[PDB]
Symmetry: C3
Subunit: 114 residues, 3 copies
């Protein structure tokens, strides 16, 4: 799994430990070992949500499996919770795109996971 | 809906009003209220199109529905037009990836848009 | 085809001509003319891979067709090789997401690549 967050929140507002907390919580939530987990945080972005430039975030979670109705609702509660607590972004100004990747379509270490 | 534009055009060349124009024109084009529309503009990028570093853009549009043959061609005319007028990027140096998202695969406000089951 | 690389490697560590090299190599690999290849490299990113901030990369390759089991394995060897040689990123700290795009879902030049039906 890999999680990307793009936000207009300033870099200085991203707390020490944020990437590590995302890694650990995503490990817990997806059931995948933490050595698999990639996280990517992009602050200081030029963004608007609903026409407003108040804090917001556009995110993606890719995973090989473990993507679906109830699972994605659980991920959203977890991830919105973290974005609200750590970056002070309101959950209703967050979008998260979920992608169920086929193993043949994820490259790693000179090959793929197929 | 969310629209992202990544471009090698400098930040200083992005005109006042650009994010708001994108928001408004996308609301009109998709027939969805502007309150739902997210836009993201990323200037000053290291990118090439056809091996040339002349102005170009790589974009994404995500929507739950309202994605398809004729609709996507209309979005391209709209969005290429705006990128040409506002950022002076040639339409033949723009790619836009269109994504028809399933409601169960879009998170928002602690949940997703799949509330039925 | 479009190839995006996001990495925590410094901008200064990206060789001049890297974009051109990626363009040429991708043209050859995909069999598409270079005029249609787009490349995008994003350095200095705040990233972790397996909980570590050692050099890593998260990438995307989009193509209309020419995506598949054997082909993707070939692309991974090629692209991991270039990232290792040019950016000094270990192949086991690279992810590449492959996307087989439908022609109707790729916009270009005021339209899309679905030109056959109305
Ligand atoms: C548009 C959208 C935003 C982010 C990712 N994919 C699509 C969007 C947002 C909210 C909606 C709510 C109800 C119905 N449709 C919606 C969209 O299409
Ligand atoms: C490659 C591409 C570019 C942007 C998004 N997805 C894929 C591409 C570009 C143009 C083409 C024209 C004809 C046939 N195939 C094409 C591609 O694969
Ligand atoms: C994490 C991942 C990263 C990028 C795209 N999709 C998923 C990941 C990595 C390796 C795996 C191997 C087997 C099964 N699942 C995996 C993941 O989810």
């Amino acid at each position: 799994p890999m999680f990307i967050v793009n936000t207009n929140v300033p870099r200085a507002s991203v707390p020490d430990g944020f990437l590590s907390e995302l890694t650990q919580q995503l490990a817990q939530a997806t059931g995948k070992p933490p050595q698999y987990i990639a996280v990517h945080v992009v602050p200081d972005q030029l963004m608007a949500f609903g026409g407003s430039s108040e804090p917001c975030a556009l995110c993606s979670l890719h995973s090989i499996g473990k993507i679906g109705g109830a699972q994605n609702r659980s991920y959203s509660k977890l991830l919105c919770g973290l974005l609200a607590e750590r970056l002070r972004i309101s959950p209703d100004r967050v979008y998260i795109n979920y992608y169920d990747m086929n193993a043949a379509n994820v490259g790693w270490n000179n090959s793929t996971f197929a």
